[PDB]
Structure formats: C-alpha cells, structure tokens
Amino acid sequence: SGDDIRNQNVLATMAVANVVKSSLGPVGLDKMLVDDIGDFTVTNDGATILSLLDVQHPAGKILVELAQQQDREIGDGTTSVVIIASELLKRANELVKNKIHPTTIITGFRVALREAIRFINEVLSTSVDTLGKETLINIAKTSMSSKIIGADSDFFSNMVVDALLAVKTQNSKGEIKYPVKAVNVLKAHGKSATESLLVPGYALNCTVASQAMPKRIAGGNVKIACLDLNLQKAAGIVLERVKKIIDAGAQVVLTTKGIDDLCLKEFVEAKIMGVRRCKKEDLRRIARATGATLVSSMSNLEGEETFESSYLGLCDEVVQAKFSDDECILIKGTSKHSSSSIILRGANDYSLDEMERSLHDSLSVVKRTLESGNVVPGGGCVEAALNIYLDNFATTVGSREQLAIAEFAAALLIIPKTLAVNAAKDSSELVAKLRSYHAASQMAKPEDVKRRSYRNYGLDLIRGKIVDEIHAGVLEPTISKVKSLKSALEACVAILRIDTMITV
C-alpha cells in the first residue's frame, strides 16, 4: 500500500504501453506475438495486439479490459486508450510526489473532460466541404496511392468521389448514408486508363437481348417489368406473354431466363425494349432502383403476365448508348434509385482487376469517412488544440486542480509525440511546431482577425511537414475521439484509485 503500490501500478501500465507504443501510425512497426505452442504472428492491429497480450500484473487487466470494451463497443480506438492512459498515469505519479491527493487528481481530470468535450464539440467539422475541393479526392488518393493505378489516381479518384456524391440515401429513417454495393462499375479493355468515363446513371449488367429491338422506350416516364420465367418454347403462350407485356404496358422488359425468337421479334413489332439474362443481385437492386419486381413464378391466383400496373417499376429515362465496345442499358433517374455507373478503361481485365482491388478499398474507405457526420481534424489537431486550449483553461479554476489541468493537457501530446517517433521524423521538432501552429489559432482567429490564421494544420507522416489536414484530407470520427478521451480517463481514474493490494 501507499507509494509502493502506486509506483508498481505505473510501471505495469508503462510496460503495457511499451507494446503498443511502436504500433501507432500507418507507417508503424509491428510486434511479434509468441505462444507456448510455438506459433508466431506479426501484426499492427491494435485489437489483436491487445487481445493476445498476456498481462500478469493485475493493474493491466483493467487497462486491457477497457480496450476490449473499446473494440467490442465502438470497433476502433484500441491503441489510443493505452497510450493516452499510460501518459496520464506517468504524470499522475509526479503529482503524487508533489503532495497532490489522489482524489484531487481525479476531480480535476473529470473537470477537464467537461471542458474538453465542449472544446472538441466546438472545433469539430461536419460531413461538408467535400464537393468541388479535394477533401474526398485526397482521402481517396490516400487509399489509392498504394495501388498500381497510383500514378493515374487523379483521374480515377474523381470518379470514386463524383459517383459517391450522388448516392445519398435515407437508409433507416434518414441516416443520410451511402450504399456500399452501388455504382455498377464495368471493367473494360476499351482505351487508356486516364480516359475512363463517368456515367450519369446506372448500367444494369446486360444489353438489349436482340439488336433488333428498340433500345430507348418512354424517354419521359417508363415502366419496367422484370420477369424470371422464360419466354422460350416449352410456344404461342410464352409468346403471348409478350402480348401480356403489351396489354399490361411494360415499356422496358427484363426477362431473366431468356426470350424466344418469336418473342424477340414480337418486341420489335411491339416497339418494346427487351432484355435477357440479367444478374440477379442487380435485378434486386433494380427492384429497389426502378422498382421492376423479379417474378420467379406466375401464380397470383392463376395470373400469368407482367401483372398490369402491379409488378412494374417506374423510371425516368432508359437509354442504351454505344461508347466504343460498351452497349448496355442506362437508367437516368426516378423517384428513388440512388444508383450510378462507371466505365473503366485500361490495358485489360487483368489490369482492371486492380480497379477491382482499388474500388473495393477506395469506395469502402471514402464511404467510411462519409459514414460519420461529424468528423475530426486528424494528425494531433484534436490532441494539440486541446493542449493549447486546456492551458488557458488553467485560469478558470486556478486553485489545486490547476496543476492537474496542466498534466492532463500535457499528456495529450503523447499522441503527436508517438506519431512522430513511429514515423522516423524528428519528434521534438514536429511536436513543438504543431503546438505553435495551433497556439496562434486560439489568439486572433476566434476574434475573426485573420490574414492566414486558420487551424486544422496537422502532422503529415509521409511528406514530413505540418499541413492543413483539411486540404490534405485526414479525418477521424468525432464519436471516436470523444469516446477515446472518455474511455482514457475511465482507466486513468480506475488505476489512480488503487491504493492497496492484498495477496491472500
């Protein structure tokens, strides 16, 4: 008990930090995990690093257990909990030796959270400033610089974003979120990489079953009937199903299991657009895009037909435009579709499989950045701007918590400090300059007196400079950083409340 258990508690949590310290950052160093079986694994995944970490000292079971809740509860934030907390505890022991009662230390850290949450809530940004300016282009460039298309990512990333800019959906009662499986993109050998075209609408993976049938029907307002059962001879009846298409009034017909020679020609004579053999998953999205409902079998109390005005969808304009070895069906708009399409041009499908690798990641990451509404200026901006603001907060209380306000604030530099150490760049130069760039942002900028007095400058780990992370495009969720700090002090208080350990 006493200063002995307090010193032992800190050494335990610093040893835990020695494991995650080197893992912070996209360019960090990995740790090798070794079991008694004889297997080994090497990863920078913070959740895996902590999950397999064997902690014998009982204090670390608290720190790790929190991070276990952090991953299971949020899904990210596992590295910041250990690094942030270990610095809070390292500096707290100095307050103990300076005759600061553990209760006062805890009280002030909680007051700092009440102040810090307000600061973070004020200095954050919303899901805006992403159109017409390279906020999602540089975010996409970040994901795309690791791809073979990297050299041409300026041309490809324009489509990644511009397509995603139009697929805003309401999801669950107006979440305002983008569809993950969307923007039907075609890997094609057509032309050079930089000439890939962005399509203003959706392309169902198919063409007009017969080149003789008309390809654009009802330019203003068109109804689409999606059928599964074939029109093929099993023949006047399966042909008559076209006469039911005529009487029921389907202008674009999506027949999945194929169309008879008489049905194909009957569509021509009927001036109706016929389509054969579409992808089932796209047809289900067509059911949600235009509304054309795939009829797997014709029953409806002995009904056999497209079911006039029932199973038909609604679309604005359906066009098949020839783009030089690309003849597919385009969907303009409608009441609710939220769909689009991209043409990929390049060397060949094996090279366009890099676009499969690129868009799988790039569409996922850009969507994740737009998944969160409120976003955080990354790169130590949320840590360093707190460093500056919390220094001025020292004047609000100014009694006994003033010492803890400082040590809490200074502990927030462990993140921009560790980001630099793990990046090989000069840690003392980068951190100090980060403070000075955020220092002046609190002086005249909030007075609306600014020539170039603008914050959101953060640590660039690649070019080795401090850059405006808005124009550079490094963002992190506000739910993550706010929950990160909330979690961090939860363990900091928990460890600082341990003043006795009895072994029975």
Partner 1 sequence: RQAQISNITAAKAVADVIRTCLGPKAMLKMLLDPMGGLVLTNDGHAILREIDVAHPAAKSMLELSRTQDEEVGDGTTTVIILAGEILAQCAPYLIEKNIHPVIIIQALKKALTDALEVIKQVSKPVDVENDAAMKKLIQASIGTKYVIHWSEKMCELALDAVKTVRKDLGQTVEGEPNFEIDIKRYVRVEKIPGGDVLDSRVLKGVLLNKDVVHPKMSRHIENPRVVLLDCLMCEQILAVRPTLVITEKGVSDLAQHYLLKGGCSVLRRVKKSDNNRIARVTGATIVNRVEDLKESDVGTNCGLFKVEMIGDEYFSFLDNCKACTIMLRGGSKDILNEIDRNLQDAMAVARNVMLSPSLSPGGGATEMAVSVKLAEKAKQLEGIQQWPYQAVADAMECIPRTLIQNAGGDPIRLLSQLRAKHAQGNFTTGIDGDKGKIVDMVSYGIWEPEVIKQQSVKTAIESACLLLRVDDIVSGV
Partner 2 sequence: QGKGQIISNINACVAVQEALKPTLGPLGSDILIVTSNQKTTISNDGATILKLLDVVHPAAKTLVDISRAQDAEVGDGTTSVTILAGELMKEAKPFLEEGISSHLIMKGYRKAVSLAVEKINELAVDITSEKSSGRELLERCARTAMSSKLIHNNADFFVKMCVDAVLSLDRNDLDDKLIGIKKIPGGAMEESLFINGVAFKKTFSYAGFEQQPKKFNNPKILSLNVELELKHVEDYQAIVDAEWQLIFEKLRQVEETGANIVLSKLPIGDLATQFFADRNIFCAGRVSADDMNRVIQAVGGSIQSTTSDIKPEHLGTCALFEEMQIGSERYNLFQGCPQAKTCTLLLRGGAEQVIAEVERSLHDAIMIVKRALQNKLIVAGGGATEMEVSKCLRDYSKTIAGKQQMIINAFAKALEVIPRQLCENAGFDAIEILNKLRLAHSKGEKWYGVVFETENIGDNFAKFVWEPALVKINALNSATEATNLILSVDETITNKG
Residues near partner 1 (CB under 8 A):
18-19, 22, 27, 29-36, 38, 40, 42, 52-54, 189, 347-351, 423-424
Which whole-number Å values give the CA distances from 385 to 107, 163, 168, 355, 394, in the listed order?
22, 34, 32, 38, 15
Chain centroid to CA 120? 21
The partner in contact with residue 27, picked from partner 2, partner 1, none with C-beta cut-offs of 5 to 8 angstroms by kind, is partner 1
- For 287, the token pair is 């059911």
Residue 299 touching partner 2 (CB under 8 A): no
Element (H, E) at 344: strand 341-344
Using CB under 8 A as the binding rule, whether residue 400 contacts partner 2 is answered as: yes
Contact pick of 1, 103, 171, 436 for partner 2 (by CB under 8 A): 436
Q: Does 297 bind partner 2 (CB under 8 A)?
A: no
78 catalytic? Reply is yes
Assess contact for 136 and 164: CB atoms under 8 A.
Answer: yes
DSSP-assigned states of every residue in 314-329: EES-EEEEE-SS-EEE
Single-letter code of the amino acid located at 141: K
Structure tokens belonging to residue 101: 């009662």
Side chain identity, residue 24: L
Residues 256/283, Cβ–Cβ less than 8 Å: yes
Say which of 45, 76, 316, 391 is annotated catalytic: 45
Shortest CB 457 distance to partner 2, Å: 13
Q: Single out the catalytic residue among 13, 79, 255, 334.
A: 79
Closest CA to 342 of 208, 195, 139, 211: 195
What residues are paired with 276 via a beta bridge? 255
CB nearer to partner 2: give 231 or 405. Answer: 405
Single-letter amino acid, residue 212: A
Q: Which partner from the list partner 1, partner 2, none does 29 bind, CB cut-off 5 to 8 Å by kind? A: partner 1
Residue 348 interacts, among partner 1, partner 2, none and using kind-specific CB cut-offs from 5 to 8 Å, with: partner 1
Nearer to partner 1, 53 or 96 (CB): 53
Neighbour-count burial of 314, counting CB atoms closer than 10 A to its CB (0-12 exposed, 13-18 middle, 19+ buried): middle
At CA 367, angle to CA 313 and CA 284, rounded to 5? Answer: 25
- The mark string for 403-422 relative to partner 2 (x by CB under 8 A, - otherwise) is x-------------------
Q: Which of 68, 205, 351, 402 binds partner 2 (CB under 8 A)?
A: 402
Q: Which residue has 């700092």 as its token pair?
A: 112
Give which of partner 1, partner 2, none residue 436 binds (C-beta under 5 to 8 Å, depending on kind).
partner 2
Q: Does the footprint of partner 2 cover residue 107 (CB under 8 A)?
A: no
Q: Which part of the chain contacts partner 2 (CB under 8 A), choosing from 81-89, 274-282, 289-297, 392-400?
A: 392-400
Q: Least distance (Å) from partner 2 to the CB of residue 402?
A: 5
Work out what residue 22 binds among partner 2, partner 1, none; the CB cut-off runs from 5 to 8 Å by kind.
partner 1
Residue 432 interacting with partner 2 (CB under 8 A): yes
Q: Are the beta carbons of 233 and 179 closer than 8 angstroms? A: no
Give the shortest CB-430-to-partner 2 separation in angstroms.
Answer: 11
Nearer to partner 2, 428 or 500 (CB): 428
In angstroms, the CA 220 to CA 320 distance is: 15
Distance in angstroms (rounded) separating the CA atoms of residues 317 and 216: 8
Near partner 2 by CB under 8 A: residue from 309, 399, 500, 503: 399
Residue closer to partner 1, measured from CB, 194 or 310: 194
Which residues are CB-contacts of 33 (< 8 A; sequence separation ≥ 6)? 40, 41, 42, 43, 49, 52, 53
| Residue 216 touches which of partner 2, partner 1, none (Cβ within 5-8 Å per kind) | none
Tokens of 281: 């998953």
Q: What is the DSSP letter of 23?
A: G
Among 297, 428, 500, 503, binds partner 2 (CB under 8 A): 428
Q: Is residue 361 annotated as a catalytic residue, yes or no?
A: yes
With contacts defined by CB under 8 A, name the span among 34-42, 288-296, 305-313, 423-431 that binds partner 2. Answer: 423-431
Q: Closer CB to partner 1, residue 189 or residue 279?
A: 189
Cβ atoms within 10 A of the Cβ of 112, count? Answer: 25
219 binds partner 2 (CB under 8 A): no
- Identify what 392 binds: partner 1, partner 2, none; CB under 5 to 8 Å per kind: none
Binding status of residue 243 toward partner 2 by CB under 8 A: no
Complex with partner 2: residue 181 or 451, whichever CB lies closer: 451
> Does residue 427 belong to the site contacting partner 2 (CB under 8 A)?
yes
Tokens in use for 371?
């998944």
Nearest by Cα to 342 from 200, 152, 205, 132: 200
259 vs 210: CA distance, rounded Å = 9
Specify whether the CB–CB gap between 21 and 29 falls below 8 A: no
Of these partners, partner 1, partner 2, none, which one is at the site of residue 189 (CB under 5 to 8 Å by kind)?
partner 1
Supply the residues annotated as catalytic: 45, 78-79, 361
Chain residues that interact with partner 2, rule: CB under 8 A: 99-100, 395, 398-400, 402-403, 427-429, 432-433, 435-436, 439
